[PDB]
Curated annotation (Swiss-Prot), chains A, E:
This is Acetylcholine receptor subunit alpha. The lineage of its organism: Eukaryota, Metazoa, Chordata, Craniata, Vertebrata. Pentamer of two alpha chains, and one each of the beta, delta, and gamma chains. The chain crosses the membrane at residues 211-235, 243-261, 277-296, 342-360. Glycans are attached at residue 141. It comes from Torpedo marmorata. NCBIfam families: LIC (TIGR00860).
Length: 370, 369, 370, 370, 370
């Protein structure tokens, strides 16, 4: 009725969708961004890729959408679908690995005045720093910049909307844990050109990694091996009868250490941990190495151990006596006096190396835990 | 020119013909539609999860009464082409195997006969969830059932009436195609108060299993078994190889364990039955047991596992004395038990070893029955 | 200012698929350039890569220089993809995957008819890295790209620095490094005998890699391994009799470890590229380790066995003593370890040589290409 | 004829494609949603991912499509492609982990006075909380919330069929699991203005008994060699060395087992239960075998004149046999017996315990099938 | 000017592209096709997949494209957009694993006459036999047929154009080498139907495969494992005192190659070959087993080598004489003589079955080499 058909048709005719609500040569189209990650689905620190939930709150005004009693008078605020709207080519700077998912053909709301919001339920593919400094106990801050993609601060400008945590909807299924995250605004003008360039939202993800299951399995076969090597020390000094017997273990155990290496480097390759983490294992594991080789070479270190009728009796007794000598010689080879030395020599070494391994372990755990 | 401009303007396919309207001469019984199924290839089989990726020639036929042409259409050329959007196309749904939309068997070039009859038949790369069940492994290897037809229309808007499966069975499959029957039908159901959509029901009864896993897998068993078999022959020829004999247990043991490990791996990739999987692991355990037996049986026994006259009598004393020790050991040796051991190892290997291929047969006979 | 009429005027005559070619004998002036921003996948064994390229596209078409209502209004215009001549880009030698987000994006029409456009593109390509690129001397990645549509007698591409870079935004998480990026603008005439040249864009990228992590995983194990065998070698002189087999247990253990290595890193080179030089020293320094190793057992294999009534009976017993002595004497002339002791120093210096031959040469294959 | 062209025409003349079968802001269009499940194909019980297939039966009324003589009274039922009605761009609050296949753009069944029937089967990528709690016998339940991803319940009301319909209504026979019941409850969280999603409960039971069987054999068969290594001491004391061979062997075996367990839960993990205590059972055989190894170690050794010669002979032999007789006193077999029966207590106690826990685990936490 | 608008307008009205230039009831549409293959980026012998590029040189004629001074006169040869063309659904009969890529949206060659060509730089994935007989030394010829898809002879016809090799641009980085490539034409009518069916181009790729990597490592462990077997035989002569030691190396050996066959199955099923090959390794190596079977069984083959004062002097030397003839007994069995026949018996037999392995191996390559 009330100019019913005349209302609706007029609107269609003189209105070009593609036109950008440019208002004189100035303020650019003022458009603000506001991301609220509802939640995260999955991440790969190794490949620094994340699939996340984002509701993008996009705001801007088109004074061409203002109305009178025949549009606003009809029903204050209403639902108009996107299409007709000029969609900022939003883009995560050093990220952007994937298209915005569910950004397309959604709707928006127009007020009696004009103000419009476009907030389609997104979830997409991301790309943020993790560097080999993300899995640390001391984390790294995922630097993520967002802003207008192909338009300049003269044609348009993307601005921020508010502060909010990243652990606000951080995934509890993540193999990592959050410290804090902040985001502040910025305008990037380049010494290149004397012009005034796009605006941007810079995310900073500060989170520290490593789920604790890993922790237990690995350090315990170490104190495990510690005891066998501990036995590697005590077994010899309290019984050199099974030196070779331990030859076996030395084989079974470094190979155990070798195969643990396949498993944890793929972990290494599975998750990017700051290499300086690797040196822990480096000297630790390798002392199992230098100590053995010496301990067991030393274990090994030892030469071979690892009237007339009366005279008859004395030529015979003399035979038993110098072989008597001989027996004592090889025993004069494998002494039990210094195998005790190596026992405390290295156990203090191990309690040193060990407590030294615990050192930096404990130390930056004095930093991380904080 | 024979009324051609005018006539195809008469048909205007899209404009004059109702493509959104199916010419079933209005509400009646149905448009006589017929489907033809010909597999062009089977590329992948997954026995474990009852899923198959296979190609089919979707041969389709139905008479387009508004399609009938005249001289400058019909007779001008008693056969011509017209795209999908300008040809009515049945909405053939792979009834129980289309849980994976059809590809390039979709909106493709169709064949236009002269008196309305039309012919559309392109290629279908599809995925299916055929009746594998954990019964698609016994020797019959079940019967894979599939139904094809025009999904949308019913018994008063569509009637589809009705080729071997091995006609294009893939030769790189780990199975064997024994038969493939084809018979159409139509059917209503309980909640529906009317009959509808007719369909192409095609059962594929197949079979599979390698004659290769048998090769390298039983191979080690008679080889390994001879080790455990020799194990008991070797306790005689030289049981003194105690530690070294022990080494072999570790070694025949680690061999045994991951051999079984490779077994489930290929297993998960294949739903294996409980009947067969036990004979494998049951018998390697037979040796595993006898390896443990090997243990004890090999280390089981408690031990085998006048002045001048005065002085030498001392020695004859020390003589005899430890001769008692020496012998306390052969008491344990237990050697007249030797042959019986390896004889009662032979007998059982024969019993069980036979029991298996005995069972192999007692189930090998009835299928061949 | 005829703003409406002008727009409506040209759109009347506005021509889509026709190039802004003054006439037909001198082509149009097309500008292009690429700034790397992402080198996503380096599969050198197959010679392929994925990069987010800034496709700087530029050309001229005054078919739309405007008046006061559009040129003067703003010397800058952002008009839709589908609305002007667009270079369907691709890398002759590389692009093996149609560009992604490299097209259909807002272009730029200044006021005089200058056209600027720059979409980001993730795409696949195939540069060199053909049985070389793993050295220390690097194979220059040569990618030439051009429109794959028309040929230079109508189209002409331009470029700039051919001296200045790929490391401009070369990824820091790459297992490699770049040292120079040269680029030339050229005509079309290849080995295949094609004429009517369509100019293209050459992309040189001589880059370095090899930042070994596996190096010392390889270097310490081998030393531990060498020592282990040198244990096998010197440990015998120290070790007891129950050590011949002791040594054997090590061979078993030594190569269990060996081919396990042979299985580990061979995998390495298949998933990534390949090259034989570094490969030669390992397996053959490895085969020599094996060689003198089994040689050792063949060495601890070599040697023959080391692998009145009163007096008549006193006579004969004094014989078993001398008799068996002759026997233990056997042991003597047989196990007088000249070969063994010397075998230690044999492998020792041979060790030093194999090592020097290798690490000295590794010194060279890092020092010539240094 | 009866105004057929007329009706027909007017309808398509006035009919609106993109409009909602309701009049203004009110009770809206009461759409019927009800899916008869086909079957399910993959349960990623580990990440809580669900790919199933069912029918999307939708149905409401288009009093805008009521026909007349020929299409209404002529043929009360006629098929017509959707594309012309508001379609629940339904997403699943937890699930809907991906797009629709055979869900939208398909024909529909339109009745005479406006009823609309659309029955499409589809595959849908979902994600329900089957969490790492999909293996306890007490299992758990999940929330499956379906609903549109641009619409807010304001211009339509959603309504269900049964809530007991069950999910085993089309449970996959191919499932290594089983089901007890499927609850269906209509929801409108007030955290959003938009009335929305419906929660569907999975009181799932997944009992695939296949390899834990030969897992038992290790525990017990390994025990065979275990009880054996604990039995071998007073069986063949010389077990002394061979014993250590056993544990190398025993430990490598269990460590390989360690190898298959992490990579197998890698796709279907839940509570540790089984692993929790077999982990203890592990540690148990592990340490028991190692302290018995220390049981093995604890032994510092084990691990006239005429007549004078005679006399010197009398003393030689006797004197040292006591010495080696001392070794007897030292390595007697008291411990072996006592701890081989402490072995009796330990292994049969810790044995009947997880035996029990396991016992308690399958029967006790079984009835919460609700 | 020159009938400017009149010439391009008339062309669009009475011109059609859906249609094919059918000329009376005869030879079909004269289609000229050919392969111009210049790169083979990726292929897998195992899955017999080939993603290469071949510009589809098509050549045929349409009189309707003939012109006068107002199109020919304009500029002799003019290139029209492909759209105007009826494009055949060409496809790889037993291949076609992938869409041709880069053919759409391209340029078409038109002549004053009508001649037309369009060589598209088509890249696509293929699927042709390689079977297990792909990579031998004697090759297989992959049968690749190509021709119209859904069109029968009664409407379109294609024919070869020229012979050109496959090695003309074959991959020098291929794990294979070519010998010859032939392509002849034909028309296939089927006994099914009395009709005259499609035409097609059948390519046959004749080329031998297999790098030598797998080769070097199959034979090294073989000779090396034959060294330990050789040791196997020689040791009992030079160190039978280590028969057990021998046992250890057989657990060693055995596990190693049993593990060698693990590699085989992975590699073989990971890279295709005709089974007849592994047959070589099969028995040859089961031969080391069959032989160690007998040889060490034989090695362990042997029972256990695997006055009155004057009186006791006699009871005593008696004690000694009894045992002495007894020790003679165990040596009575280890005669050190048959040990030399067994290594020589088998050394020759392995030199012979090795030479046998060597035989068919070289015979087969005296067949391949050809």
């Amino acid at each position: 009725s009330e100019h019913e058909t005349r209302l609706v048709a007029n609107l269609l005719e003189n209105y070009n969708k593609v036109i950008r609500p440019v208002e004189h040569h100035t303020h650019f189209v003022d458009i603000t961004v506001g991301l609220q990650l509802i939640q995260l689905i999955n991440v790969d620190e190794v490949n620094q890729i994340v699939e996340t939930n984002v509701r993008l709150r996009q705001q801007w005004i088109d004074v061409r959408l203002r109305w009178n009693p025949a549009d606003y008078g009809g029903i204050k605020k209403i639902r108009l679908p996107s299409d007709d709207v000029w969609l900022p080519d939003l883009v995560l700077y050093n990220n952007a690995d994937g298209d915005f998912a569910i950004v397309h053909m959604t709707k928006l709301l127009l007020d009696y005045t004009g103000k419009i919001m476009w907030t389609p339920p997104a979830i997409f593919k991301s790309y943020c720093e993790i560097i080999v400094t993300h899995f640390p106990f001391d984390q790294q801050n995922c630097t993520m910049k967002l802003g207008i993609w192909t338009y300049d601060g003269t044609k348009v400008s993307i601005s921020p909307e508010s502060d909010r945590p990243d652990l606000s909807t951080f995934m509890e299924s993540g193999e990592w844990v959050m410290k804090d995250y902040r985001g502040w605004k910025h305008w990037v003008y380049y010494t290149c050109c004397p012009d005034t360039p796009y605006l941007d939202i810079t995310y900073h993800f500060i989170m520290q990694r490593i789920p604790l299951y890993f922790v237990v399995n690995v350090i315990i076969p170490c104190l495990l091996f510690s005891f066998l090597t501990v036995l590697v020390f005590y077994l010899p000094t309290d019984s050199g009868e099974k030196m070779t017997l331990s030859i076996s273990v030395l084989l079974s155990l470094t190979v155990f250490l070798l195969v643990i290496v396949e498993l944890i480097p793929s972990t290494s390759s599975a998750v990017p941990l700051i290499g300086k983490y690797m040196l822990f294992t480096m000297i630790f594991v390798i002392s199992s190495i230098i100590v053995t080789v010496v301990v067991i070479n030393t274990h090994h270190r030892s030469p071979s151990t690892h009237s007339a009728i009366e005279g008859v009796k004395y030529i015979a007794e003399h035979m038993k006596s110098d072989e008597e000598s001989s027996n004592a010689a090889e025993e004069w080879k494998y002494v039990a006096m210094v195998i005790d030395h190596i026992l405390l020599c290295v156990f203090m070494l191990i309690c040193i190396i060990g407590t030294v391994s615990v050192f930096a372990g404990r130390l930056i755990e004095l930093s991380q835990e904080g | 020119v024979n009324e051609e401009e005018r006539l195809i303007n008469d048909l205007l396919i899209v404009n004059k013909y109702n493509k959104h309207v199916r010419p079933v001469k209005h509400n009646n019984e149905v448009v006589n539609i017929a489907l033809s199924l010909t597999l062009s290839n089977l590329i992948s089989l997954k026995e474990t999860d009852e899923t198959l990726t296979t190609n089919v020639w979707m041969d389709h036929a139905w008479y387009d009464h508004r399609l009938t042409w005249n001289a400058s259409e019909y007779s001008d050329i008693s056969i011509l082409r017209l795209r999908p959007e300008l040809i009515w196309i049945p909405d053939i749904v792979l009834q129980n195997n289309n849980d994976g939309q059809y590809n390039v068997a979709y909106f493709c070039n169709v064949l236009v006969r002269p008196n309305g009859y039309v012919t559309w038949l392109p290629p279908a790369i599809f995925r299916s969830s055929c009746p594998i069940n954990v019964l698609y492994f016994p020797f019959d290897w079940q019967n894979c059932s599939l139904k094809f037809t025009a999904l949308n229309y019913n018994a008063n808007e569509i009637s589809m009436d009705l080729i071997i499966d091995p006609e294009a069975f893939t030769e790189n499959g780990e199975w064997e195609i024994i038969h493939k029957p084809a018979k159409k039908n139509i059917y209503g159901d309980k909640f529906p108060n009317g009959t509808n959509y007719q369909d192409v029901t095609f059962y594929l009864i197949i079979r599979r299993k390698p004659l290769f896993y048998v090769i390298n897998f039983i191979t080690p068993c008679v080889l390994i078994s001879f080790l455990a078999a020799l194990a008991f022959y070797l306790p005689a020829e030289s049981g003194e190889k105690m530690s070294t004999a022990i080494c072999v247990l570790l070694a025949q043991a680690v061999f045994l364990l991951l051999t079984s490990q490779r077994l489930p791996e290929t297993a998960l990739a294949v739903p294996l039955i409980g009947k067969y999987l036990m004979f494998i692991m049951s018998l390697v355990t037979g040796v595993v047991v006898n390896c443990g037996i090997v243990l004890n049986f090999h280390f089981r026994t408690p031990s085998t596992h006048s002045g001048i006259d005065s002085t030498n009598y001392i020695v004859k004393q020390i003589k005899e004395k430890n001769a008692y020790d020496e012998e306390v050991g052969n008491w344990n040796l237990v050697g007249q038990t030797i042959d019986r051991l390896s004889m009662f190892i032979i007998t059982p290997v024969m019993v069980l070893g036979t029991i298996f291929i005995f069972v192999m047969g007692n189930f090998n006979r009835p299928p061949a029955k | 200012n005829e703003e409406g009429r002008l727009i409506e005027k040209l759109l009347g005559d506005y021509d889509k698929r026709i190039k802004p070619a003054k006439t037909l004998d001198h082509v149009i002036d097309v500008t292009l350039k690429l700034t790397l921003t992402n080198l996503i996948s380096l599969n050198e064994k197959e010679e392929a890569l994925t990069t987010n390229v800034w496709i700087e596209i530029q050309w001229n078409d005054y078919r739309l220089s405007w008046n006061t209502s559009e040129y003067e209004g703003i010397d800058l215009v952002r008009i839709p993809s589908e609305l002007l001549w667009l270079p369907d880009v691709v890398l002759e030698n590389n692009v093996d995957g149609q560009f992604e987000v490299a097209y259909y994006a807002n272009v730029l029409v200044y006021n005089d008819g200058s056209m600027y456009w720059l979409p980001p593109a993730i795409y696949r390509s195939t540069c060199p890295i053909a049985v070389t690129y793993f050295p220390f001397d690097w194979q220059n990645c040569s990618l030439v790209f051009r429109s794959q549509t028309y040929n230079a007698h109508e189209v002409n591409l331009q470029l700039s620095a051919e001296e200045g870079i790929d490391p401009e935004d070369f990824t820091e998480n790459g297992e490699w490094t770049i040292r120079h990026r040269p680029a030339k603008k050229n005509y079309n005439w290849q080995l295949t005998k094609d004429d009517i040249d369509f100019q293209e864009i050459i992309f040189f990228l001589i880059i370095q890699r090899k930042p070994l992590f596996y190096i010392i995983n390889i270097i310490a194990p081998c030393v531990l391994i060498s020592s282990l065998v040198v244990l096998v070698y010197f440990l015998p002189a120290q070790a007891g009799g129950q050590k011949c087999t002791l040594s054997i247990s090590v061979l078993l253990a030594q190569t269990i470890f060996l081919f396990l290595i042979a299985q580990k890193v061979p995998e390495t080179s298949l998933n990534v590229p390949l090259i034989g030089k570094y490969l030669i020293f390992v397996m053959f320094v490895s085969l020599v380790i094996v060689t003198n190793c089994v040689i050792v057992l063949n060495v601890s294999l070599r040697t023959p066995n080391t692998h009145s009534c009163v007096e008549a009976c006193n006579f004969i017993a004094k014989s078993t003593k001398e008799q068996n002595d002759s026997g233990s004497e056997n042991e003597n002339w047989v196990l007088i370890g000249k070969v063994i002791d010397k075998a230690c120093f044999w492998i020792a210096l041979l060790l030093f040589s194999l090592g020097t031959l290798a690490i000295f040469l590794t010194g060279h294959l890092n020092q010539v290409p240094e | 004829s009866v105004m057929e062209d007329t009706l027909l025409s007017v309808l398509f003349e006035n009919y609106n494609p993109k409009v909602r079968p309701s009049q203004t802001v009110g009770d809206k269009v009461t759409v019927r949603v009800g899916l008869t499940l086909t079957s399910l194909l993959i349960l990623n019980e580990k990440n809580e991912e669900m790919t199933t297939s069912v029918f999307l039966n939708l149905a409401w009324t288009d009093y805008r499509l009521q026909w007349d003589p020929a299409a209404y009274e002529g043929i009360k039922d006629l098929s017509i492609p959707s594309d012309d009605v508001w379609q629940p761009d339904i997403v699943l609050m937890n699930n809907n982990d991906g797009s629709f296949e055979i869900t939208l753009h398909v024909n529909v069944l339109v009745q005479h006075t406006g009823a609309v029937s659309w029955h499409p089967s589809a595959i849908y990528r979902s994600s329900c909380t089957i969490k790492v709690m999909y293996f306890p016998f007490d299992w758990q339940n999940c929330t499956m919330v379906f609903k549109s991803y641009t619409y807010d319940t304001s211009e339509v009301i959603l309504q269900h069929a049964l809530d007991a319909m069950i999910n085993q209504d089309a449970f996959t026979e191919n499932g290594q699991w089983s089901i007890e019941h499927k609850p269906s409850r209509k929801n409108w969280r007030s955290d959003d203005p938009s009335y929305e999603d419906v929660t569907f409960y999975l009181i799932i039971q997944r009992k695939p008994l296949f390899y834990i069987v030969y897992t038992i054999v290790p525990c017990i068969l390994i025990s065979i060699l275990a009880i054996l290594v604990f039995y071998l001491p007073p069986d063949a004391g010389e077990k002394m060395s061979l014993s250590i061979s056993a544990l190398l062997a025993l430990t490598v075996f269990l460590l390989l087992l360690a190898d298959k367990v992490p990579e197998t839960s890698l796709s279907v993990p839940i509570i540790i239960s089984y692993l929790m205590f077999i982990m203890i059972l592990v540690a148990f055989s592990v340490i028991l075998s190692v302290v018995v190894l220390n049981l093995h170690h604890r032994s510092p050794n084990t691990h006239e004149a005429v007549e004078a010669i005679k006399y010197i002979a009398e003393q030689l032999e006797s004197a040292s046999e006591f010495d080696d007789l001392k070794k007897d006193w030292q390595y007697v077999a008291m411990v072996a017996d006592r701890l081989f029966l402490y072995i009796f207590i330990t292994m049969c106690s810790i044995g009947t315990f997880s035996i029990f826990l396991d016992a308690s685990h399958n029967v006790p936490p079984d009835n919460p099938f609700a």
